[PDB]
Amino acid sequence: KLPPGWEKAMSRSSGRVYYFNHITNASQWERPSGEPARVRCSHLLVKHSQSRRPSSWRQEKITRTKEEALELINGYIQKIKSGEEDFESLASQFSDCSSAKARGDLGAFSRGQMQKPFEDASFALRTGEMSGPVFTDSGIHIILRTE
Numbered sequence: 001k002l003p004p005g006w007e008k009a010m011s012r013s014s015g016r017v018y019y020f021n022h023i024t025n026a027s028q029w030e031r032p033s034g035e036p037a038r039v040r041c042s043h044l045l046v047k048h049s050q051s052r053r054p055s056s057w058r059q060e061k062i063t064r065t066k067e068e069a070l071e072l073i074n075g076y077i078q079k080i081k082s083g084e085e086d087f088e089s090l091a092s093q094f095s096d097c098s099s100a101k102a103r104g105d106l107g108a109f110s111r112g113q114m115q116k117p118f119e120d121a122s123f124a125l126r127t128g129e130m131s132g133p134v135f136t137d138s139g140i141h142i143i144l145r146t147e
């Protein structure tokens with residue numbers, strides 16, 4: 001019926017059907033369209049107090065809760081989707097990864113190198129598509145597949 005990992009859902013506030021991907025945590029209104037050795041992705045990372053290394057170039061001691069980190073991620077997703085902000089802009093300013101200085105770009109990679117929830121989301125995204133919140137031991141990610 002639908003590309004890898006998609007299911008039909010119903011909006012609780014509008015009653016209109018939408019589509020949800022349980023691998024990328026993406027959601028959209030329109031019916032989804034539809035694997036390579038490698039993909040290229042950028043990401044925006046928000047760390048929290050239970051991240052493996054609760055430290056980043058932005059903060060020596062990262063104290064925010066996981067719930068607070070998810071709220072920030074959700075807010076960034078809203079502004080990217082509204083066009084109020086660009087993914088690259090928010091990654092450069094607010095990502096708790098070193099890759100912030102490269103607008104979030106991680107380069108190209110194969111399966112085997114990344115943490116599994118990050119890797120599955122990266123490979124299930126289509127070129128150009130953005131993930132919803134993706135959870136790993138590092139933190140919560142927004143992932144943008146660029147190639």
Ligand SMILES: Oc1ccnc(C(F)(F)F)n1
Pocket residue numbers: 098099100101102105106107
């Ligand atoms: O692969 C590498 C090596 C060093 N730095 C980066 C990044 F993310 F900052 F651009 N990527």
Ligand SMILES: Oc1ccnc(C(F)(F)F)n1
Pocket residue numbers: 113114115116118119136138
């Ligand atoms: O192994 C590691 C270390 C840091 N970040 C990641 C990932 F995939 F979540 F981006 N994996």
